[PDB]
Amino acid sequence: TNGIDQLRSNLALFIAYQDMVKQRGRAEVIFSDEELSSTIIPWFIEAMSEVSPFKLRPINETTSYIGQT
Amino acid sequence: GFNLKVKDLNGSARGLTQAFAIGELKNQLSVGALQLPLQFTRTFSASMTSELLWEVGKGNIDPVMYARLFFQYAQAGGALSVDELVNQFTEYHQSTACNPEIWRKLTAYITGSSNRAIKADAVGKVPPTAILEQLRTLAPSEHELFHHITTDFVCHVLSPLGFILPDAAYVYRVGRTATYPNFYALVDCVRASDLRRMLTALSSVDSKMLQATFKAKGALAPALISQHLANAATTAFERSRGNFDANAVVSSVLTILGRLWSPSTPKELDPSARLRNTNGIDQLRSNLALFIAYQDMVKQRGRAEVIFSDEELSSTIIPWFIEAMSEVSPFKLRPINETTSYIGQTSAIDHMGQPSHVVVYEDWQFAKEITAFTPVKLANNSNQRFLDVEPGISDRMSATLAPIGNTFAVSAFVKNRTAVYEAVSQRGTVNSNGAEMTLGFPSVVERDYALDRDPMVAIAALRTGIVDESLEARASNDLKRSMFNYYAAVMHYAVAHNPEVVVSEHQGVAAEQGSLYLVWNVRTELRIPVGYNAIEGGSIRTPEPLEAIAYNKPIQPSEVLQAKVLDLANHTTSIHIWPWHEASTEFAYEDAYSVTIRNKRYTAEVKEFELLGLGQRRERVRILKPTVAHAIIQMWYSWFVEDDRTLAAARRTSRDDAEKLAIDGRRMQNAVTLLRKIEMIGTTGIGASAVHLAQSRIVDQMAGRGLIDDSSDLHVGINRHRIRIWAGLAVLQMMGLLSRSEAEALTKVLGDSNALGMVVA
Amino acid sequence: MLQATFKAKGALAPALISQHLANAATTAFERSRGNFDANAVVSSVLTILGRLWSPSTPKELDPSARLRN
């Protein structure tokens, strides 16, 4: 069911995971069920919003711009 | 063609019972009543004839094209299941992200070490395939196919505004494929659909990346989007980690459809009104050959109710999709009325007048011309080859087949076959329990014989019902497909006649009442015993489709029935190569005539040769055997050996002198059949060539010894007809049709009888 | 069907699509075997609306936030 299939791949987003997991425990309200609807809840999220200045990112460059020696 | 009893059939051929598909094992006949009414969308199907040649390599790229190609490839039996092709494909492009070097190196072809970036593009596109053959050194490719695939992304047109040429494309010849589907065929369909889920995104991504590419600059600088190209496609490859699971989803929509069928109310089988609606299934319930696929895989794998679906949400995701709503299958969903009709009807009359000869039959004009290929291999020095069509044996042999394109019309065949008509005394008394159930289809032979297996063994496996089951897994396959295609064809055609059907367990071993068959009804048939029912109630009520078949009134065939026949000279100046072989390589072979007169051996010994009158050898060419052209005459061959051995078994059994008269007239009338057939075959122009020329040779043999040079001594009467067959022998083998182990049979049968003219011529 | 009809010929030959015409419509008539059931669906949206109205909290009358939207 769409989205999550690449959404799993996001990883800084995963940092946000471990972060709020750090602050508020986990507090599993689980407003979602197991499927219907475990859909309505992830109907949407921030990157698929344009509402954020922040935006979803393609494949390869990540956010690279630092050399090494 | 081929035939059974009308009363008996299970003792004649178990394969056409519903019960055999149900795996009833010969015993009790199905009958159980308590019924649910149905309707027809005349059911989803395939095509029937689609002989054509796709272009690839021209850089257009479209997953629907390749879906056909892999599907046909499995239909070539190049590996096995399409599912195997696909899992092995993903195993191939598990060379996915572990090879950034595919980008680094193809971009190196773009020239390259692109950190020296610029609007570098000049020219060169169309054969990365060779430098990608170096990528084959990078990406070994035991199959030609996926290697031939991956080229496309870099070079569909990318970068679309230069690079640049092609002025050339590629090739493949899809043929007509299987008529009707099954478990494995279906999972192959949805699997092909996951590939469908693959490639289209795989094109669309680049389709937008190019939009975001030539930022200009011109085409902009490389080591970027080029170095990108398909990494997103690899992510698209990773979008493809999970379509579904083919066997599970197919089994799912399957068995839930079966629950929609079964009388069994309870919660295990209670198709939710919550989702009895929701599109598709509402006409999908109506499909019925699809229902044959149901009872089939229900036969092989029990039911194994994984029920990946719930009762409603989501009993939706699973039947989100299926094969007909895929374009991935060559097979396609079917409208309302015609079903797949194209067979006429007649029936024997004794002025009573129950049928004794059911007449159900073909409808099909075979190819009017065929053309040899010259296998001009040169590129790659392997499978890569060009065929260059040119006239040769082609034109002239074809024109000689034109009379055969008249005298071996199926309509004439059955019409003469109907003329068997009067039998066992008179007139008016032909009736005695069973009656012959003559039948056959263009399709089953055109395909199973195309696979080069000789259908008749499978036919006999059906006739005995029980499988020989000693076959190779490949032959195991051809046997299976032979079965369900025979069976289902007969089913949904019979359905194409009778409007109404109802579901029927069975019971027996239950095995949980999910097992089930069908029972039908018609009324018009006259008050006579026929099958087990007789007619009982002024209506049929039979499990068995053949029963409904027999009662049907005489009709006419509808379909265009033409072989369509391929052409390729265009594509030939284009080719390139594809899995072609099967033809095979050297267009023909000699057959040796012989005769004795004045008690002396002569042995005409003729080749091959063009024989037609221009040497020599030629060489080299090979022409494709039409599947059809040999398949049909093989139907008749099946008839020949049928009446032969079976009524010979009658020669063994009923020694009654009247029955002696019957075996006499019947065997000797098949004898007069092939008699008059080869008879008219001899007047053919190539037949004329074989006559005058082989006769010229043996007359030259007369000049061998000096005293048997005393002019011709052969010609009186018997010799002419006796060599008339030889024309039918050149027309036999290496006319491009018959497969020998054939004239063999014909020889023995021509020995069976007086033959003679018998008159005329 | 008309789009697929006048194959031309002109309007093409009959005893076919004409003889078809509405058989598919009869199948469309059979597409109509099951819309819903009027009294049931009306009563449904009805009483669920009433549950959306009523003060009564419990599970018999708890319009799901899963679908209050």
Cβ atoms B757, B721 nearer than 8 A = yes
What's the gap in Å between the CA of B288 and the closest CA on chain C?
Answer: 15
Contact B336 C30 (CB under 8 A): no
d(CA B252, CA B258): 10
d(CA B621, CA B387): 9
Token match 């407003």: residue?
A: A31
Element (H, E) at B728: helix B718-730
Token match 């003792």: residue?
A: B11
Amino acid identity at B115: N
What's the gap in Å between the CA of A59 and the closest CA on chain B?
Answer: 5
What's the gap in Å between the CA of A53 and the closest CA on chain B?
Answer: 20
Q: Helices B718-730 and B685-702: crossing angle, nearest 10°?
A: 120
Confirm or reject contact between B556 and chain C (CB < 8 A): no
d(CA B711, CA B704): 12
Contact residues on chain B for A60, CB-CB shorter than 8 A:
227-228, 231
Q: Collapsing DSSP states into helix, strand and coil, what is residue B241?
A: coil
The resolution, in angstroms to one decimal, equals 4.8
d(CA B372, CA B393): 7
Tell me the residue length of chain B.
761
Q: Which of B261, B328, B335, B245 is nearest to B293 (CA)?
A: B261
Which candidate from B232, B234, B239 shows the least CB-CB separation from A5? B239
Contact residues on chain C for B41, CB-CB shorter than 8 A:
27
Cβ atoms B318, B308 nearer than 8 A = yes
Angle in degrees, CA B566, B567, B568, rounded to 5: 130
Rg of chain B in Å (alpha carbons): 31
Q: C62: how many CB neighbours lie within 10 A of its CB?
A: 12
Confirm or reject contact between B231 and chain A (CB < 8 A): yes
Q: Which of B394, B400, B396, B398 is nearest to B621 (CA)?
A: B394
Contact residues on chain C for A40, CB-CB shorter than 8 A:
66, 69
Which H, E and C letters describe B695-715, residue by residue?
HHHHHHHHCCCCCCCCCCCCC
Which candidate from B39, B277, B337 shows the least CB-CB separation from C34? B277
Give, as one character, the DSSP assignment of residue B625. Answer: P
Task: Tally A–C CB contacts below 8 A.
Answer: 6
Cβ atoms B519, B33 nearer than 8 A = yes
Contact residues on chain B for C17, CB-CB shorter than 8 A:
none
Distances (CA, A) of B331 to A8, B169, B185, B677: 36, 27, 10, 38
Amino acid identity at B749: V
Distances (CA, A) of B270 to B231, B267, B276, B283: 46, 5, 10, 19
**Which subunits count as partners of chain A given 3+ CB pairs below 8 Å?**
B, C
Cis link prior to B15 (omega < 30° from 0)?
Answer: no
Beta bridge partner(s), residue B54: B172
Report the chain A residue with the minimal C-alpha distance to residue C65.
Answer: A31
Cβ atoms B341, B495 nearer than 8 A = no
Contact C23 B337 (CB under 8 A): yes
Contact residues on chain C for A33, CB-CB shorter than 8 A:
66
Phi-psi region of B162 (alpha: psi -120 to 50; beta: other; left: phi over 0): left
Report the chain B residue with the minimal C-alpha distance to residue C23.
Answer: B336
Sign for the pseudo-dihedral over CA of B256, B257, B260, B261: negative
Contact A59 B235 (CB under 8 A): yes
Angle in degrees, CA B519, B522, B524, rounded to 5: 160
Q: Which of B524, B441, B538, B422 is nearest to B482 (CA)?
A: B441
**Which subunits count as partners of chain C given 3+ CB pairs below 8 Å?**
A, B
Q: B658: how many CB neighbours lie within 10 A of its CB?
A: 10
Report the chain B residue with the minimal C-alpha distance to residue C18.
Answer: B337
Residue of B99, B153, B308, B317 best to disrupt the A interface, most CBs of A under 10 A: B317
Copy the structure tokens of residue B410.
């199926």
Contact B282 C34 (CB under 8 A): yes
d(CA B752, CA B636): 18
Distances (CA, A) of B539 to B10, B216, B355, B433, B623: 22, 80, 17, 20, 53
What's the gap in Å between the CA of C36 and the closest CA on chain B?
Answer: 9
Amino acid identity at A27: A
Which H, E and C letters describe B22-68, residue by residue?
HCCCCCCCCCCCCCEECCCCCCCECCCCCCEEECCCCCCCCHHHHHH
